[PDB]
Design a protein around this ligand. Sequence first.
Ligand SMILES: CCCCCCCCCCCCCCCCCC(=O)OC[C@H](COP(=O)([O-])OCC[N+](C)(C)C)OC(=O)CCCCCCCCCCCCCCCCC
Ligand SMILES: C[C@H](CCC(=O)O)[C@H]1CC[C@H]2[C@@H]3[C@H](O)C[C@@H]4C[C@H](O)CC[C@]4(C)[C@H]3C[C@H](O)[C@]12C
Ligand SMILES: *C(=O)CCCCCCCCCCCCC
Ligand SMILES: [Zn+2]
Lengths: 55, 171, 122, 12, 128, 459, 55, 88, 156, 174, 55, 64
Amino acid sequence: GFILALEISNMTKNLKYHYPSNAFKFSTLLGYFPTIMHRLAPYMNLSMSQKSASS
Amino acid sequence: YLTHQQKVLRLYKRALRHLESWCIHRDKYRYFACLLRARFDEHKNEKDMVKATQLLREAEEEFWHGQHPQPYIFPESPGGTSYERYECYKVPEWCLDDWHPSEKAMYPDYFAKREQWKKLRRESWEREVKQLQEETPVGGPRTEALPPARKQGDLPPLWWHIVTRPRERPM
Amino acid sequence: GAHLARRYLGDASVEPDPLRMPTFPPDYGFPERKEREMVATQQEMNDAQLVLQQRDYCAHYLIRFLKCKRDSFPNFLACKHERHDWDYCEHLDYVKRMKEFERERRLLQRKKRREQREADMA
Amino acid sequence: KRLFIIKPSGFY
Amino acid sequence: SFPKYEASRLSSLPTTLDPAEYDISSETRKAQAERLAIRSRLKREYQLQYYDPSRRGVIEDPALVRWTYARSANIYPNFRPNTKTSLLGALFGIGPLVFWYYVFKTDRDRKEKLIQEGKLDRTFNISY
Amino acid sequence: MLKYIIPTIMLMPLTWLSKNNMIWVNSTAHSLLISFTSLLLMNQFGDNSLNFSLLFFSDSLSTPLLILTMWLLPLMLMASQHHLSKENLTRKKLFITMLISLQLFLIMTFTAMELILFYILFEATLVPTLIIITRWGNQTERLNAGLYFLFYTLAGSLPLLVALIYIQNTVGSLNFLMLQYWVQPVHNSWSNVFMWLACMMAFMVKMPLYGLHLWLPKAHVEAPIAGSMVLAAVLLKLGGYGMLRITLILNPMTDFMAYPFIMLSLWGMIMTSSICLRQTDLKSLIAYSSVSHMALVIVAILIQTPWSYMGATALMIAHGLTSSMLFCLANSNYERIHSRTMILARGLQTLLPLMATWWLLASLTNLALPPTINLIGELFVVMSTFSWSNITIILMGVNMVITALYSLYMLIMTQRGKYTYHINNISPSFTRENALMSLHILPLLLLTLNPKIILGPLY
Amino acid sequence: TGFYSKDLIIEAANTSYTNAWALLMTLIATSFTAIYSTRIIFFALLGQPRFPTLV
Amino acid sequence: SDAPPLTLEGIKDRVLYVLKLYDKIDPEKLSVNSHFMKDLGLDSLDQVEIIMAMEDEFGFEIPDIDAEKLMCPQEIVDYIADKKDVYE
Amino acid sequence: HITKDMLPGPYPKTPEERAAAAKKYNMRVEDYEPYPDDGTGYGDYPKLPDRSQQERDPWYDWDHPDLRLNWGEPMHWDLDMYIRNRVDTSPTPVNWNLMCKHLFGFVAFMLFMFWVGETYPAYQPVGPKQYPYNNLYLERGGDPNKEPEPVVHYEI
Amino acid sequence: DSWDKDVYPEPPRRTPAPSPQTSLPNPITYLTKAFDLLVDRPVTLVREFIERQHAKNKYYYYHREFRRVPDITECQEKDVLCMFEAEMQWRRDYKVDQEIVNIIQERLKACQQREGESHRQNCAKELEQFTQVVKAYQDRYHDLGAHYSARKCLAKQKQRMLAERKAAKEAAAA
Amino acid sequence: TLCLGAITTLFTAMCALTQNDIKKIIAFSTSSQLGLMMVTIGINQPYLAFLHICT
Amino acid sequence: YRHSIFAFTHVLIPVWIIHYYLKYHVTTKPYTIVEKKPRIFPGDTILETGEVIPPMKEFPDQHH
Ligand SMILES: CCCCCCCCCCCCCCCCCC(=O)OC[C@H](COP(=O)([O-])OCC[N+](C)(C)C)OC(=O)CCCCCCCCCCCCCCCCC
Ligand SMILES: C[C@H](CCC(=O)O)[C@H]1CC[C@H]2[C@@H]3[C@H](O)C[C@@H]4C[C@H](O)CC[C@]4(C)[C@H]3C[C@H](O)[C@]12C
Ligand SMILES: *C(=O)CCCCCCCCCCCCC
Ligand SMILES: [Zn+2]
C-alpha cells in the first residue's frame, strides 16, 4: 500500500490532465449511499406523513 | 437575469476554481490556468450572438462532465466547514433594551453612547420615509436598490439594520 | 492454503473434510497407539479457573505460567521462559493436528487408489 | 481590543 | 462525447444546462423584470416596518397565514369523495389495519396451539 | 376522602372573599397546601386498598392520579395569570371557580367506589372543561372545538350508562369491591359483544383511540393554557383509569374483542407520530403526541398482563407531567409572538438561554430517555407486548424512531438556527415562567429515584 | 501500539474456519489503510505550501 | 480566533502587493484609484483573475454579483474592510 | 388583521378568479398554476416548483437567511419538508439513475460473494482440536451421573 | 451475623498465600497499608462513635405475623366476608412466593460470579434449585392475568389436576 | 458479524482514498478500524477485539 | 497547595464516605459485593486454613 500510494501521489505532480472515472466519483461521493438514502427515505417518509396520514 | 457577458465570466470563474481543485499544486494549476485562458481567448471577440450562445452552452456541458465531484469550498462560504459557525453568537442590538439597570451600570459609557445612536435613528426616520415616498414611481419600486442621501445632514434611507448589524466574530 | 484449491477447484473425494474428520478408525495403521498423557488433573484446572478452551493437553504448562506471573508481579517482563514452554507445547499440539489432516488426506488416497483396480479389473 | 459583547439579559 | 443530464424529482436540472436559460426572448425578459417588481414591492412594504424605530412586535406575514390555513383549515372544503380519494383512503386507512390483524391473529393462533400441546419452551418464563 | 373534598370546596369562598389583588396569591398558596396533604394517600398496603367508607376508596392506581390531579391546580393558576390580567375581576374569579370545580369532580372520580357514582362524576367534568374552552379560548375555532369535545364524549358515555345499569340489575351491585368477588365470566354471545363495546367505547373515545381522536387536536389546541394542561394531563387518564377498572368484569371476552383496538392503537401510534413530523402549529404537534402516547396505554390495558398494567400506570403519570410541561413551554412563546406557528420564531436559544434548557429536558422526557419514568413506563409496555406477539416489537420500534425525530425537530425548529430578524419583543423569561417549568420537570425526575409509587396495584 | 492488536487479528483471521470473501476484503482494507494514511502525510506535510500568504 | 485583526492600511498594502505581482499591471502607474478597465487596459477576463487572487489572499470568497462590480483596488479595500468589520 | 378575502379558497374555474388568486398570492398570473382539481384539498393554493431551499441563492439578502425566504413570498406547500434540514433536491454531479445502479450493483455483488465465500470457507489444514478426557464432559455442563461415551485421543 | 447464612450460603473462602519470586516491591502491599491507615482507621472511629450512641437509646421493631385463615376453597360462593379474608391471604402468599424466587435467583447469580470460569460445573446445584422453584411458581401464578385472584388460581389448579388425572388413566392403559 | 464487519472495513476504507477533508479521512479511518473490530468478533476472538479498542 | 486541597476534598473525603457506605451498609447485606474466588495453583498455601495444595505430576520432558 505504501509503495502504491507513493507512486499514485507522485503522479499528481505530473503535468498531465484529469480524466474523472466512475470508480473515482463512487468513492468520493461515499458510494452514493448518503445521496440516495438521505434524499429518498426522508422524501418518502415526510410525504407520507402529510399527504396520507395528516391530510 | 444574467446577460451573456455575466454568464461567461461566471463560467470562467467556476472553471478555474474546479480546475484548481483537480490540480492542487500551484505550478500545475498555473499551467492549466493559462491553457484554459487561451480557450476563452480563441473566441474572445465573437460577433454572431447565436454562435456565441452555442459556444457558451457547449462549455457548460464540458464543465458539468469535468467538474470536480468534491470541489474546494472556502471555510466560511456556503457549504463550507465554517459556514454559519458563529450565527449562534450573533445577538441583535435590541436585546440590550431589555437589560436590567444593574447590568447597564457596568457599561455607563457604552450605553450613554448607545442612547445617542437611538436618538439619531429616531430623529432621521420621518425624513427617510419621505425621501423614499417621493423618488418611488407612482405604482411602486421596480428594483431593490435604495437611493443615497441627497441633502447634507440626512442619512441614507433604511440604514439602521445594515449599520448596527452584529460583527462577524461577535465573541 | 494450497489444500483449499484442491477440495474445491478439483477432485473433492481425496481431500479431507474438516467438519467430518477423522473418518477411518484410529487403529487402521499403528499396530498399537498410546493415549495422550494429560499431566494436569480436573481439580487442578478447575481450581486454576482456566477458560474451558484452555483446558487442553497443554494446560499443565499454562498453569505453571500463570502461577509464575502472579508471583513475579510487579515484574511483567519476567516469566518469559514459562510462556515459551506453554507456547511450544501448543505448537507441538498444532503439528499433531497437521499430521492428523495428512493421515486422513493419504488414507483417502487409498480408497481412490484401491478402487480403480477393483473397478477397472471387474 | 476589548469590544462590547452583545448578549441577551442574563440577570433574570 | 458529453452524456446528457437526466433530472429527477430529487435531483433538479442545473440552471447552466437548462435550455430556457439560453433561449432569451422578449417575452421572457419582460416576465423576469415583471417578477422583480413584485419582489421589490413586497421588499419595500417589509422594510418600511422592519426599519421602523417605534415598532415592537411581530411583522405579520400574510403569506405565512395563508400557508398554515391552506394546510389545516382549507383541506376539507376542497375535498370531493371521488374514485381517487376513496381508493387512496381505503388502502392506506383500512389496508394496514387488516394486514396487521392477520399478522397477529395468525401469530397468536399458532403460539396458542403450541402452548396447549405443551411444545413451546416456557421453562423460565414467569414474567408476562 | 372528606379531608380533601372539603378543603377543595373551601378554595371557592377563599377566591371570592379574598382581596381583588390577592386572588392568585391566595388560591395558589392554599392549592399547594392541599397538594401537600395528598401524600397521606400513600398509606397503601400490599393486599388491601384504602377503603375509607361506603362511597370513596383509594388504591395504588387512583392514588398517583389523585396526587397528580391536586398538584396541577397550582400550576394551572400560575400559567393563567398573564393572559387573564386584562380580564374583569368577576370573570377572573369565575375562571378559577371552574378550575376548582374540575379538581373537585376529579378527586371524587378517581376514588368513587361505586361505578355509577364514578359515571356521574366522570361525566360532570365536561361542563367546566367545556366552559373553559369556549369562554376563555382565543381563536374562533374554540366554539367548534367545544362541540366536538362534548358530543364525542356523550356519544360513547350514554351507552355506558345503559350498560352499567344493566350490570347492577343482573349482578345486584356496582360497588367495585363487590364486583371483585361476585364477578362472573362473560359468555360469548352477540348480547355480550355489545355490552363489551358499551363498557369500553366511552373510555376509548376519551383516551383517545385512533380514529376517534379528532376531538383532541381541536380541544387541546383551542383551549386556554390551563384547559390544555388539565385536558392532556388528567382528563385523558379518565379513560385509561376507567378501562383498568371496567376490564375486571369483561373476561374472557376481552381476549378476542381487543384485536380491533390493539390494531388501531399499534398502527395509530405510527400515524399520529408521523403527523407530528409535518405539523405547522407547535401546539398542535404537542396535541398529536398525546394521541401516540395514549396508544401504548390502550394496548397495555387490553392485553391484561401485570407488566402491561405497571407500564400503563407509569405512562399516564409520566405523560401527565411531560405534555403539561410542553404546553406551558409552547404557551411561553405564544405570549410573546402571539402566534402558534412553529416556524415563525426561531433561534430562540440565543435570546432565552435558560428556557432552551427546559425545552431540552421536556424533549428528552418526551422521547423517553432512560431512566426517566417515561422510559420505564414505555419499556414495561414493550416488554409485555413482545410476549403477547413478538412481531409487535417492529411497530413499537418504529414509533420510537419517529418519536425522537419529531421531539428533536420541535427543539431544533424553535430553539436553534438563526433568530427571526423582525421579532424584537422577546423579553427575558419571567420568574413565573421559569418556576412553572421547574415545577413540572423536578417531580418528573425525582420520581425516578422511587418509581414504585407510580407503578400501580400490580406492583 | 497498533501492532500488538491489529497484526494478531490479521493472523488469527487467516488461520480460522472463516468466510473466504470476508477474509479477502479484510486484507484489501489493510492495503487501503496505508494509502489514505500516506495521503494525509503527503498532502499536509510534504510538498510546497498551498495555504494563504498570511498564516 | 487568535489571528491578528486586519487594519485599513494592511488591507491596502496587501491588495496592491498582489497587483504589483500581476505582470499585466505596471507598478509605476498602479494607484489605489487606478481603474482596471479605463486606466490599465485590462479586459474583464483579467478582472475575474484579479478578484480570484484577492480571495486567495484573504481566504474568503467574493460572490460573482459583487466581484464583477469592483473595478478599482480602493473598492476592493472597502469591500474587504466591510466584510471583516475593519474600522481603523 | 387578515380577512377571508385574502385567504386560500376553492379551485379557480373562470379566468377572472385565476387573476384574483394570482393577485392574492403575490404571483404574476402567468406564473400562477394551482394543483389539479382532484379533490384532495389543495384548493387554489399555487403549485410552486418542487425545489429545496438549498437550491436558492445563498448570497441574496433574504429576509429569512436560514429559510432562504422573503417576507410576503408565497411558500411552497411542502416548505417544511424542503428546509435545509430535510429533503434536498440540488443537482448532483452524477445522474440519479446511474447512482442507483452503482450502489445497487455494489451491494448486490458483495452479498453474492459473501454467500459464495460462506459455502466455500477457508480453513487451515488441521484436524479437530483434541480436549482431555470425555471432551471436558464435566467441565462444560455434563450430568455427573450419566456415563459419557468415552472420547479417546491418540498420538501420531 | 447481619444476615442468615442458611438462606444466603457463602462457600468457605480459600485465599492462596503470598509467594513472591521477585526483588521489586509489590505496589499493592504498600497501598494496602496506606489505605488502612488513611481510610479504614478514621472510618472505624466514626462508626464506633455512632455505634456507641445507638446502645444508649436501644429500641426494637418486630416482624408482623399473620395467622392462617380459611382459604378460598373453603368459602361459599358469593360469600364476600369469607372470600375477602381468603383473597387477602392469597395475595400475601403471592408476594412471599415472589420473593422466594428472588432469593434463589440471587443464589444463581452470586454462584456464577463466585466460580468464575468454572461456573458451568460448580453452579449445577444452584441452577437445579432455580429450575424447580421456577416450575412451581409458574404452575400456580402464570397466565392468570392482571386481574388475578384466588378464584382464578384455584380454577387453574383444578384444570391442571384434571389434566394429570386424565394422564394417569392413559398411562395405566396397558 | 464477520460479513457485516468485512464489508464495513472495505467500504469505508475505500471512501477515505479520495476524501479531501482531513477530519473526514480520519472519520472513515475509524469506521474501517471499527469494521476490523467486528471482523474479530466474527472469528470468535472477543479479547483481540477488546485489545484493539484500547490500542 | 492547590493540589493538596484537591486531593483532600475530591479523593480523601469521597473515599471515606464510599468506604463507610461499603463497610457498614452495603457489605452487611447478602450477595451485594460478590468477589470471584481467588485462583488456586498447584503448590499454594491457603491462608485461612494453612492447607497445602499438592504439586502437579512430573512433566516428562520437552527441552525445546
Ligand atoms: C427499523 C426501521 C425503523 C423505521 C425508521 C427508519 C427507516 C427510515 C425512515 C426514517 C427516516 C425519515 C425521517 C424523516 C427525515 C428526518 C430527517 C431528515 O430530514 O433527513 C435529512 C438528512 C439530510 O442530511 P445529509 O447529511 O444526508 O445532507 C444534508 C445536506 N448537507 C449534507 C449538505 C448538509 O438526512 C438524514 O439525516 C436521514 C438519513 C437516514 C434516513 C435513511 C435511513 C436508512 C436506513 C438504513 C437502510 C439500510 C438498512 C440497514 C439495516 C437497518 C434496518 C434494520
Ligand atoms: C488544583 C487545580 C489545578 C491546579 C493546577 O493544575 O495548576 C485547581 C484549579 C481550580 C481549583 C478548584 C476551584 O477553584 C473550585 C474549588 C475552590 C476551592 O478551593 C475548593 C476546591 C475547588 C474545587 C478547587 C480545587 C483545586 O484547587 C483546583 C481544581
Ligand atoms: C490458506 O491457508 C487460506 C489463505 C487465505 C488468505 C490468502 C493468503 C494467500 C494464500 C496464497 C496461496 C499460497 C499457496 C502456496
Ligand atoms: Zn400576550
